[PDB]
């Protein structure tokens, strides 16, 4: 549904994963930062699109980026 | 309350107000309604004659109406009101 | 000029002076002549008569409504309507703009530059509010020396 | 002690309140023509039509525009029968959209208890087909019988 | 266990904490970095729960803030008595009030504003006041302006005492947490000591001061020759000539011969025909009764003397089979959360202020209150707006209790837990009754507008068309008029004149009150009122119930109260917060209270307020057009919003021209609100970025970065200008129209 | 007016029948699963 | 990492019933089951609205959305020291285990998971939309 993209400006601060309320983001190993980890979005079909990860990203400009695309019953947040 | 043997009973698929009574009428009342409402069954057929029959029945009494039945077919019954500037 | 009679010879402007005192004279009829609210209306009438004798003596132009109209084109007769108090204004408004600009330069080279804007340093402020008196000689002086404007390589620019 | 969860399950969005699972209310709601799961859906659709057909003559003969004439029986009954024919087409296009020809039944097969019942045939393409014709014949006869008992026989009532 | 717990010198009285602005919050103590720091400085200024987690220091902050509020109200009362003493015509109005308008504000003759000092009468120029202070001082027995000056300087003394107590109960001896948690003692000393002894003391004033002075004012005696209030206490024969029951001298009180006090303690009812205001023998019997009843009710709870009630024992014994473990933990709610008590107290104070508004137009308590129509309209309108604001704030602090003080571990299977457990049912059935009320009131208005537009007056809901007579109200008004004969014997007359007992009271040639009719128009507008109150309840109760979580956002309590949104996800989560429900309920309070005061103004300008000529003929201000024009929106726009606005727009060049200026400036503030309400932060942030670029070009960049207002702040600014502009529009239109035709 | 009865025909069809034709055919069309 | 199997014999927390629970999306589309092991009998805030007494052993809770499982799960990870996992249950009977996928929570890094949805460039090196007209690819997915 929603497309969440991680860019190489990430410092591995992990707070995009901690702010995620639908378990989209996970921290995979990486070689481009001091923390040696970058975020990724394997369960991007579960993304509501709330951009809590973009609110918690301290990198200017943002490393996690959520693009609101086709919206399904996962990304609409319904219970009915 | 999760079972893995009955998936409908653990998810809310309940007939909350349903009944399993097979019949409560008699054969004389049942044969009258299916005979009369037998040409009204098919959705594609019923949508055809309701649109075509509904367009005719509003154009009939729209046109055969009288002055007392509807005021738009009565017309004016007094002198017209002249506007300002002689118009 | 522009089809407007002068207000000293305008019959409509003298009509508005007549019907303004008459409104205030009828307000005076229900008070005692030595009472305190009657002294306020008597001071209002003398304020009105001072106003109408000031508007006619400045060469104001009155239309068909009996009202003084301002000519802002830059006429040699009409300098005090727009040009003279505009140059008085822009001197005062440039004084506000020069002492607020010079305060920000004086607090940008400080230890905590953001605490000097919520808490304005009055000895730093009052020593340049006096310096805003001669500001056209200091604004064009900074314009000619290049200190008024900042080069675009050191200015935060949003991307295309 | 009085309020229970819905069939003992607290995580289904409902409660077993007295307005829901009374001895009198759950007897009532289980005999209403919409919740008979084994009756053929044309027969129980005639009762859903007779009811709604009858009741709708009332607000159309006592409140409509032609309520102050001698044609108030004829104007309001055909207005009541007009709402039957519109809602029949609303019932027609609902069954076309919701149910496809040859599909299963979108109905809960399980009852309040754990016993397995047959699927409700009303939520099908052919079950809602016979339900729509049951509402059309029942609704047009429910309007006409309420018109007969009010403006043909003219039974005495306080308001008519 | 109830006793005084204080401790000495918690914080030192120093100005070093005045210099640092954001000392209360950890985020604002670092100093400013953006311009949003200034707005969070004011937003978190009074929010004492966000400062510290210790409820003791929070309660001390709230107690000294109460004392500062009391100081501000005493400064305000000092000003209004000093304005009566020096800048008013209160002695001139008190000589004859049927011809001289109440005025207590003189403006300075500077810029043409001296025309606002209008001819109010009595040889005086000033702003005609509508606050009702003149009738209040006439009911208090105030005869001279020296008494007003003495009350002003006494109020200044009490304002200094409240400032000293606010300093004392935060810096010298501040109470501890268990002192504030003695709610039984606080209720015992508020019911008996505050509302009981206050009613008893005002009853003593209304026996000795208000009653004989106001009896002499009904006799046409000049107030300069009326004896002073202490002369009735000293010379009791002077008090006995007006009431012979004073000749017995306190012996019927202790011998239970209270009927011998029937000369000055009566259950008359109705209005004084001399003045148009309630009797003070009834207002003194009223205060003596609510004092002998609030002092009884103040001996109910258990402090430390054995007798009484623990209210936890009252609550925990109140449990039912439809609830189970209900009312348990609510004592722990209402003694550990300031916001829950604030919600209950604000709901009662707002609803009580609405009670005050109705029980003052209908039973006017002050002499010449009813016949001064400006005072009646302004007092009703002011108390409706205060009451609506306080009930919206009640729902606000209810929601703040949910998001910041509701502990789910202490609340299992009680009333609050079960109300949260079926909040979908509450909000959905409230939604149904709101939509049903909206059609069955406003669509009835639309139907009347349509058939009046289509030339069908018989197809409407009129008193001549299809009638919708309020038979319950028309029966309860007959039940309240035909009461004295059988259900309430000992009454001389009836409770109010608006019930149907006759008594066309004419004071100064102007109608005080008469029987208020209730017809189809009143039915329609009362269903509008019920609809608007229900919808305001719907947004506000939805914000209270969905403050913790929702089906949309299950972690909404972690986001807080003043958060804007979660984001553009789940379709968009804009205004999910409980604050945003308070924000929308403020608009629905505008709608509700504005239609309430519009129905009030038109209903009594059409059916109550007017004049009485010879041979008993009553000519109202807008004669009889409420029954036929207030059933359509075109009548409301035409015979109310256009016909009665023909004195707010042509008031220019007169004393009421400031009402025209504030009418237009109130339209300005309203259209200014629509800038903040309809727009959003990011547009203004990029526009400010362009302005910051222009500042960078000329080296006038501030170090405090210019930022757009926050989304919560932009909505707050928009609703503040919407309420301020619309309320000031109605204030200007009301206070120009009813002053002009009054 | 030449023919007064075509007001009595076309205003009921284009005002009542044609929205009932168009909205019912669209609601079938917008809820086709295809 | 072997995913845990849903036992379907552990019981529910003591809850009086809520109206915020499973609607018809549970019956036809999906519903979410969260399973966790408890130290003792506690009281927790229900993410559908309300409070329930959680059991002294393993607990099973049926939820409608994936966000309700994290809102509950982060509540009993910070207030309580309880490890949790949840599932996705479909009406045909298939239980899809969802979190944590490797057995360790996604805040902590694991060597088994791979980078997906990761761009080696930044935002400023994304291509303009004018040079990607009429293509399935967009400015960020390449
Ligand atoms: C410290 C003084 C200072 C200086 C020299 C200027 C000068 C500048 N500003 Mg301004 N401005 C300031 C204060 C200042 N401003 C402050 C305090 C605010 C907040 C109200 C702004 C808000 C602002 C806006 C909204 C705009 C400008 C713009 C401008 C330009 C034209 C003047 C104008 O539009 O009228 C002045 C505009 C005002 C809104 C009046 C604010 C001036 C206050 C009263 C002075 C306070 C100074 C004092 C020490 C504190 C010019 C570059 C425009 C621009 O982008 O450049 C072309 C524009 O769009 N400014
Ligand atoms: C019989 C004693 C008594 C009485 C008269 C009151 C009266 C009052 N209380 Mg108090 N209170 C008492 C004892 C009493 N209290 C007890 C025992 C407790 C402890 C459990 C509390 C704790 C409490 C708190 C925590 C607060 C109050 C507040 C209030 C005020 C109500 C708000 C208001 O605007 O009212 C109308 C206000 C007035 C009429 C002003 C009157 C002020 C004068 C100086 C009297 C007050 C002094 C003292 C209480 C009684 C002295 C009597 C004196 C006249 C002889 C009012 C001053 C509230 C307030 O505003 O805080 C300041 C507040 O929330 N009370
Ligand atoms: C708190 C209010 C209050 C206060 C301070 C007063 C004060 C006074 N009353 Mg009382 N009184 C009050 C309530 C009050 N009364 C009420 C409500 C009634 C109705 C029962 C009266 C009716 C009353 C009478 C009948 C008389 C007093 C009298 C007295 C005086 C002597 C008693 C005393 O001081 O003790 C004193 C001036 C006596 C007096 O000297 O009159 C001025 C007197 O004869 N009182
Ligand atoms: C008994 C009265 C009472 C109590 C104790 C409080 C107490 C509180 N309120 Mg409030 N509340 C109440 C009633 C009250 N309120 C009412 C009347 C409303 C409806 C408007 C609400 C709605 C409510 C909400 C919506 C929220 C609170 C919150 C706050 C908290 C701090 C706000 C702050 O720092 O002030 C800030 C003060 C200002 C910004 C001053 C602005 C004043 C108004 C808005 C504009 C000016 C009006 C003025 C008359 C017009 C003059 C114009 C002229 C100058 C040109 C605090 C707990 C906030 C909070 O976080 O609570 C924890 C918040 O989010 N309140
Ligand atoms: C005149 C302007 C206007 C109108 C028409 C509406 C209409 C609505 N508002 Mg309101 N409201 C408005 C301005 C308006 N609002 C603004 C200013 C705000 C922003 C603050 C709000 C925000 C809002 C909130 C936040 C809430 C409402 C809700 C509602 C509903 C109230 C129930 C009702 O009356 O149903 C009857 C419908 C009407 C009277 C609309 C006219 C329909 C006519 C009568 C029917 C005939 C037309 C015909 C079928 C055409 C063919 C209704 C749909 C409430 C809601 O949805 O729950 C009840 C809700 O909670 N309002
Ligand atoms: C877009 C152009 C236009 C518009 C705005 C209308 C508007 C109107 N027509 Mg129409 N009319 C049109 C085209 C137009 N006409 C043309 C070209 C013809 C000549 C054949 C007619 C012949 C006609 C008749 C005979 C009658 C009206 C009538 C009316 C009224 C009721 C609607 C109705 O029954 O439609 C009926 C429409 C038609 C019979 C043909 C409409 C064909 C148009 C071009 C379709 C346009 C679709 C549009 C572009 C999509 C958006 C209404 C005022 C009635 C009237 O006078 O009311 C009292 C009526 O009796 N119309
Ligand atoms: C251009 C649009 C259109 C037209 C032609 C009409 C026409 C009519 N309206 Mg209606 N209306 C419409 C739009 C329309 N409406 C909309 C948009 C609104 C919503 C705001 C309303 C709201 C409204 C209400 C609330 C009511 C009317 C009523 C009326 C009737 C007034 C004349 C009379 O006295 O008959 C008196 C009545 C009769 C002669 C009864 C005739 C009923 C016939 C026989 C129905 C027959 C079946 C029908 C044709 C099936 C339709 C199929 C489908 C294809 C359209 C008339 C039938 C009144 C009425 O009586 O409704 C029937 C009434 O109560 N209107
Ligand atoms: C009566 C109203 C004045 C009350 C002042 C009380 C108070 O703050 O002063 C009591 C203050 C307490 O002194 C405080 O000491 C702190 C260091 O501990 C800092 O220096 C504070 O600036 C200083 O206010 O005593 C003073 O030194 C008086 C000067 C400040 C008062 C100025 C009044 C204007
Ligand atoms: C206003 C009166 C509405 C009647 C309500 C009334 O009579 O309450 C009766 C019932 C009382 O329940 P219990 O017997 O559990 O109450 C014991 C009380 O002490 C509550 O603790 O209250 C409810 O269950 C609320 C039902 C509201 C139902 C919706 C009404 C809206
Ligand atoms: C000074 C100045 C200026 C001016 C200004 C202007 C421009 C104006 C605007 C304004 C407007 C254009 C409007 C406004 C309006 C106002 C208002 C509106 C206000 C209000 C206030 C208040 C305070 C209120 C009160 C109230 C209340 C609160 C409630 C009830 C009612 C009332 C009213 C009483 C300028 C800038 C030039 C320059 C600088 C300075
Ligand atoms: C206009 C507007 C702004 C911009 C508002 C701003 C920047 C507030 C301006 C406040 C004053 C005018 C600036 C600060 C003034 C200083 C005290 C300096 C004094 C200068 C003169 C006022 C004397 C928003 O941020 C916004 C956010 C969300 C929705 C709508 C809107 C919105 O409509
Ligand atoms: S929050 Fe931003 S910087 Fe931190 S790990 Fe996530 S993407 Fe990287």
Helix content of chain F: over 70%
Question: What quaternary form is this?
Answer: part of a larger assembly
Number of discrete helical segments of chain F: 1
Residue fraction in strands of chain G: 15-25%
- Mind describing the biggest β-sheet of chain F? none
Alpha-beta classification of chain G: alpha+beta
The helix-strand sequence of chain G is HEEEEHEE
PDB class: photosynthesis
Keywords: PSI, electron transport, chlorophyll, light harvesting
Entry title: The Structure of the moss PSI-LHCI reveals the evolution of the LHCI antenna
Chain A: Photosystem I iron-sulfur center
Q: Overview of this structure, please?
A:
This is part of a larger assembly, with seven protein chains of seven kinds. Chain A has two helices and four strands. By secondary structure, chain A is α+β, with helices and mostly antiparallel strands. Chain A has one domain. In chain A, the strands form two sheets. A two-stranded antiparallel sheet of chain A has the order 1-4. The radius of gyration of chain A is 12 Å and the shape is elongated. Chain A starts with a strand and ends in a 13-residue tail after the last strand. Helix content of chain B is 36%, strand content 0%. Chain B has helices at residues 27-36, 43-63. Chain C has one domain (1-160). Chain C has helices at 11-28, 36-55, 83-108, 115-118, 122-129, 136-144; strands spanning 5-6, 61-62, 68-69. In chain C, strand 2 (61-62) and strand 3 form a beta hairpin. In chain C, helix 1 (11-28) runs antiparallel to helix 2 and helix 3 runs antiparallel to helix 5 (122-129). With 160 residues, chain D is an all-alpha fold. Chain D has one domain (4-152): Photosystem 1 Reaction Centre Subunit Xi, Chain: L (Up-down Bundle). Chain D has helices at residues 25-28, 43-55, 58-61, 72-98, 127-151, and strands at 4-5, 15-16. Chains in contact: A-E, A-G, B-D, B-F, B-G, C-E, D-E, D-F, D-G, E-G. Chains A and G meet through strand 1, strand 2 and strand 3 of A and helix 2 of G. The site of iron/sulfur cluster has 14 residues of chain A, from helix 1. Chain A: It is a peripheral membrane protein. Chain A: [4Fe-4S] cluster 1 binds at residues 10, 13, 16, 57. Chain A: The eukaryotic PSI reaction center is composed of at least 11 subunits.
């Amino acid at each position: 549904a929603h497309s969440v993209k991680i860019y190489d400006t990430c410092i591995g601060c992990t707070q995009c994963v901690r702010a995620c309320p639908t378990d989209v983001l996970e921290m995979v190993p990486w070689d481009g930062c001091k923390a040696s980890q970058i975020a990724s979005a394997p369960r991007t079909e579960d993304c509501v699109g709330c951009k809590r990860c973009e609110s918690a990203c301290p990198t200017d400009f943002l490393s996690v980026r959520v693009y609101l695309g086709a919206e399904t019953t996962r990304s609409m947040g319904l219970a009915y | 309350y999760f079972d893995l043997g009955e998936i409908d009973n653990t998810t809310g698929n309940w007939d909350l107000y349903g009944n399993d009574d097979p019949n409560r009428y008699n054969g004389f009342q049942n044969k009258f309604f299916e005979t009369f409402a037998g040409a009204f069954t098919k959705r594609g057929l019923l949508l055809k004659f309701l649109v075509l029959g509904g367009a005719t029945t509003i154009g009939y009494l729209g046109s055969t109406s009288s002055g007392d039945l509807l005021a738009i077919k009565n017309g004016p019954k007094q002198a017209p009101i002249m506007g300002p500037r002689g118009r | 000029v522009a089809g407007l009679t002068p207000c000293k010879e305008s019959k409509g402007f003298a009509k508005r002076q007549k019907q303004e005192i008459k409104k205030l004279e009828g307000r005076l009829k229900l008070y005692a002549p030595d009472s305190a609210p009657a002294l306020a209306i008597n001071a209002t009438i003398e304020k009105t008569k001072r106003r109408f004798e000031f508007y006619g003596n400045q060469g104001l132009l009155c239309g068909t409504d009996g009202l003084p109209h301002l000519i802002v084109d830059g006429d040699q007769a009409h300098l005090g309507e727009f040009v003279y108090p505009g140059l008085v204004f822009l001197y005062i408004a440039g004084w506000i703009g020069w002492v607020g600009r010079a305060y920000l330069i004086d607090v940008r080279t400080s230890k905590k530059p953001t605490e000097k804007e919520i808490i304005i340093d009055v000895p730093l402020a009052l020593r340049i509010m006096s310096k805003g008196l001669t500001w056209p000689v200091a604004a064009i002086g900074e314009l000619r020396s290049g200190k008024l404007v900042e080069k675009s390589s050191n200015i935060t620019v949003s991307p295309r | 002690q009085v309020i229970e969860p819905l069939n003992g399950d607290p995580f289904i969005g409902g409660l077993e309140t007295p307005v829901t699972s009374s001895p009198l209310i759950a007897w009532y709601l289980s005999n209403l023509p919409a919740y008979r799961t084994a009756v053929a859906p044309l027969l129980r659709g005639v009762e859903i039509g007779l009811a709604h057909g009858y009741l709708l003559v009332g607000p159309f003969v006592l409140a409509g525009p032609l309520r102050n004439s001698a044609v108030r029986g004829e104007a309001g009954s055909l207005a009541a029968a007009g709402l039957v024919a519109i809602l029949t087409m609303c019932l027609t296009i609902y069954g076309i959209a919701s149910f496809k020809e040859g599909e299963a039944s979108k109905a809960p097969s399980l009852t309040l208890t754990g016993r397995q019942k047959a699927a409700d045939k009303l939520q099908t393409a052919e079950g809602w087909a016979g339900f729509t014709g049951g509402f059309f014949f029942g609704g047009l006869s429910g309007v006409a019988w309420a018109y007969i008992l009010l403006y043909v026989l003219n039974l005495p009532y306080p308001v008519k | 266990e109830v006793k005084i717990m204080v401790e000495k010198d918690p914080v030192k009285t120093s100005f070093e904490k005045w210099a640092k602005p954001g000392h209360f919050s950890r985020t604002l103590a670092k100093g400013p970095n953006t311009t949003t720091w200034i707005w969070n400085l004011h937003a978190d200024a009074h929010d004492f729960d966000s400062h510290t987690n210790d409820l003791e220091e929070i309660s001390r902050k709230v107690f000294s803030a109460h004392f500062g509020q009391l100081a501000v109200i005493f400064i305000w009362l000092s000003g209004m008595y000093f304005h009566g003493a020096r800048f008013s015509n209160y002695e001139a109005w008190l000589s004859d009030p049927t011809h001289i308008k109440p005025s207590a504000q003189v403006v300075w003759p500077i810029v043409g504003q001296k025309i606002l000092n209008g001819d109010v009468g009595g040889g005086f120029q000033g702003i005609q006041i509508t606050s009702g202070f003149f009738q209040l001082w006439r009911a208090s027995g105030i005869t001279s302006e020296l008494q007003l000056y003495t009350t002003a300087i006494g109020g200044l003394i009490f304002a200094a005492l409240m400032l000293f107590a606010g300093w004392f109960h935060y810096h010298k001896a501040a109470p501890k947490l268990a002192w504030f948690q003695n709610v039984e003692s606080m209720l015992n000393h508020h019911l008996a000591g505050l509302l009981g002894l206050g009613s008893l003391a005002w009853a003593g004033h209304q026996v000795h001061v208000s009653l004989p002075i106001n009896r002499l004012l009904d006799a046409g005696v000049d107030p300069k020759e009326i004896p002073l209030p202490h002369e009735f206490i000293l010379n009791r024969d002077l008090l006995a000539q007006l009431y012979p029951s004073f000749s017995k001298g306190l012996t019927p009180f202790f011998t239970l011969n209270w009927s011998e006090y029937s000369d000055f303690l009566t259950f008359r009812g109705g209005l004084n025909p001399v003045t148009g205001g309630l009797w003070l023998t009834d207002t003194a019997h009223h205060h003596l009764a609510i004092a002998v009843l609030f002092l009884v009710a103040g001996h109910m709870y258990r402090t430390n003397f054995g007798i009484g009630h623990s209210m936890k024992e009252i609550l925990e014994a109140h449990k039912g089979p439809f609830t189970g473990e209900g009312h348990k933990g609510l004592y722990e709610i209402l003694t550990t959360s300031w916001h829950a008590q604030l919600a209950i107290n604000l709901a009662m104070l707002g609803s009580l202020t609405i009670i005050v508004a109705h029980h003052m137009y209908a039973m006017p308590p002050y002499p010449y209150l009813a016949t001064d129509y400006a005072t009646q309209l302004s007092l009703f309108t002011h108390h409706m707006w205060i009451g609506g604001f306080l009930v919206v704030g009640a729902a606000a602090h209810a929601a703040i209790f949910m998001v910041r003080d509701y502990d789910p571990t202490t609340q299992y299977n009680n009333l609050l837990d079960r109300v949260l457990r079926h909040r979908d049912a509450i909000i959905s059935h409230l939604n149904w009754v709101c939509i049903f009320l909206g059609f069955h009131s406003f669509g009835l208005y639309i139907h009347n507008d349509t058939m009046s537009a289509l030339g069908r007056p018989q197809d409407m809901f009129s008193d001549t068309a299809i009638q919708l007579q309020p038979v319950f109200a028309q029966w309860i008004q007959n039940t309240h008029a035909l009461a004295p004969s059988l259900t309430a014997p000992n009454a001389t007359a009836s409770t109010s004149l608006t019930w149907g007992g006759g008594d066309l009271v004419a004071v100064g040639g102007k109608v005080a009150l008469l029987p208020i009719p209730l017809g189809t128009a009143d039915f329609l507008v009362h269903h509008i009122h019920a609809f608007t109150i229900h919808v305001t309840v719907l947004i506000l109760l939805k914000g209270v119930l969905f403050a913790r979580s929702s089906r949309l956002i299950p972690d909404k309590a972690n986001l807080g109260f003043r958060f804007p949104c979660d984001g553009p996800g789940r379709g968009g989560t804009c205004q999910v917060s409980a604050w945003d429900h308070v924000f929308l309920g403020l608009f629905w309070m505008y709608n509700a209270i504005s239609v309430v005061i519009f129905h009030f103004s038109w209903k009594m300008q059409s059916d109550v307020w007017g004049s009485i000529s010879d041979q008993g003929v009553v000519t109202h201000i807008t004669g009889g057009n409420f029954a036929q024009s207030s059933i359509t929106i075109n009548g409301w726009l035409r015979d109310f919003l256009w016909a009665q606005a023909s004195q707010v727009i042509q008031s220019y060049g007169s004393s009421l021209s400031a009402y025209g200026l504030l009418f237009l400036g109130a339209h300005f503030v309203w259209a200014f609100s629509l800038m903040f309400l309809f727009s959003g932060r990011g547009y203004w942030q990029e526009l400010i970025e362009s302005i910051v670029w222009a500042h960078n070009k000329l080296k006038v960049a501030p170090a405090i970065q210019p930022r757009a207002l926050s989304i919560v702040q932009g909505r707050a600014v928009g609703v503040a200008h919407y309420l301020l502009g619309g309320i000031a529009t109605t204030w200007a239109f009301f206070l120009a129209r009813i002053i002009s035709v009054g | 007016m030449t023919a007064s009865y075509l007001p009595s025909i076309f205003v009921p069809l284009i005002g009542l029948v044609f929205p009932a034709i168009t909205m019912a055919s669209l609601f079938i069309y917008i809820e086709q699963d295809e | 990492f072997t995913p845990p199997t849903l036992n379907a014999d552990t019981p529910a927390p003591i809850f009086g019933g809520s109206t915020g629970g499973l609607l018809r999306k549970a019956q036809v589309e999906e519903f979410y089951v969260i399973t966790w092991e408890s130290p003792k009998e506690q009281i927790f805030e229900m993410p559908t609205g309300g409070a329930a007494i959680m059991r002294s052993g393993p607990n099973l809770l049926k939820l409608a959305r994936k966000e309700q499982c994290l809102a509950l799960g982060a509540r009993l990870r910070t207030k309580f020291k309880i490890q949790y996992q949840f599932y996705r249950v479909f009406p045909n009977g298939e239980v899809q285990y969802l979190h944590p996928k490797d057995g360790v929570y996604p805040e902590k890094v694991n060597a088994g998971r791979t980078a997906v949805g990761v761009n080696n460039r930044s935002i400023g090196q994304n291509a303009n939309p004018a040079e990607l007209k009429f293509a399935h690819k967009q400015a960020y997915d390449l």
